[PDB]
Design a binder for this molecule. Structure first.
Ligand code: 5JU
Length: 305
């Protein structure tokens, strides 16, 4: 008693047991199956032609037979297309959102222990414009969704996620497995990444932060001691190093003077960025900090002149 979806690239099939799992009040495996089929049909125009029209319209998610017939029709169309062909690119943004949701639903089995975030991360990725020279770190990466989104979208040398908390770091291990598996199932390419359990305030992480060109950090809920210690870690970063955060680490209007020479504002430019400046989501801002020690050098040059 199960349902199978054949991979469009010949990987192992996706196997779902019956009764199908319900993930939450807004997500279930039946709709995940239907949406997976629809995404594969977008990926492969021949597949849409091979598949009969009525199949994705006339379906009963509460009927094993109807869900089985839907899977059988898609599976037969995959076989016909595989036969036609007998004669790895980066996923689209829409497909990537589906993959990340699918990876999360299969990994976070008990959510008690995405949408607006996804589109915001996509905006941040578009603004920062990382290259193969960059090293990316999401400081306090949770279950790893931001790292997975960035790794699937950019060509950074490596993407890292560091998470201290036990429950998220444990779920991240499954998120990592499920992501690699689903990305292979669709035949989609992603850059290298690592989800690690650790403390970003450790001695090991002091040098790693110093050597990171792009840091993303959701610092909104951090205490003043974590924030204070992070500013100290950022003070070792290279010129041009960037920090994208949910709360600024220095004032937007920082003005260097004789009384504030110890502030992080002496060595970084800070700008408030917003998708509102065609966005229709939450009126949210993010903060881009760029390491620039010329702020401090110019102040000293002006003291001597
Ligand atoms: C996109 C977005 N959507 C909604 C709101 C905001 C945003 C947002 C911006 Cl707006 S900018 C931006 C940049 C990055 C990110 N990334 C993530 O969201 N990444 C996932 C995510 O879940 N991030 C939060 C994980 C929090 N953790 C459980 C721990 C809490 C305690 C601390 N901690 C911890 N870890 C390791 N060592 C440690 C510590 C403490 C001391 N030493 C981590 C997000 C955003």
């Amino acid at each position: 008693l199960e349902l199978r979806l054949k991979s469009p690239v010949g990987a192992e099939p996706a196997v779902y047991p019956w009764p199908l799992p319900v993930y939450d009040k807004h997500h279930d495996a039946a709709h995940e199956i239907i949406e997976t089929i629809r995404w594969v049909c977008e990926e492969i125009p021949d597949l849409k032609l091979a598949m009969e029209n009525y199949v994705l319209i006339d379906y009963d998610t509460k009927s094993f037979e109807s869900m089985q017939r839907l899977c059988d029709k898609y599976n037969r169309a995959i076989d016909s297309i595989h036969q036609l062909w007998k004669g790895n690119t980066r996923p689209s943004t829409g497909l990537l959102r589906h993959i990340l949701q699918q990876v999360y639903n299969h990994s976070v089995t008990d959510p008690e222990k995405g949408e607006t975030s996804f589109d915001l991360v996509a905006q941040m990725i578009d603004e920062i414009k990382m290259t193969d020279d960059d090293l990316f770190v999401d400081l306090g990466s949770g279950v790893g969704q931001v790292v997975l989104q960035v790794a699937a979208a950019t060509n950074c040398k490596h993407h890292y996620g560091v998470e201290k908390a036990d429950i998220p770091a444990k779920y991240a291990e499954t998120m990592d497995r499920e992501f690699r598996k689903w990305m292979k199932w669709y035949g989609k390419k992603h850059a290298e990444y690592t989800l690690e359990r650790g403390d970003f305030l450790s001695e090991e992480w002091r040098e790693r932060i110093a050597n990171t060109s792009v840091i993303f950090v959701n610092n909104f809920a951090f205490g003043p001691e974590v924030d204070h210690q992070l500013k100290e870690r950022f003070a070792n970063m290279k010129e041009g190093g960037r920090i994208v955060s949910s709360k600024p680490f220095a004032p937007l209007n920082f003005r260097i003077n004789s009384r504030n020479l110890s502030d992080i504002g002496t060595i970084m430019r800070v700008v408030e960025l917003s998708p509102l400046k065609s966005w229709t989501g939450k009126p949210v801002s993010y903060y881009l900090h760029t390491i620039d020690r010329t702020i401090l050098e110019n102040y000293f040059s002006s003291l001597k002149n």
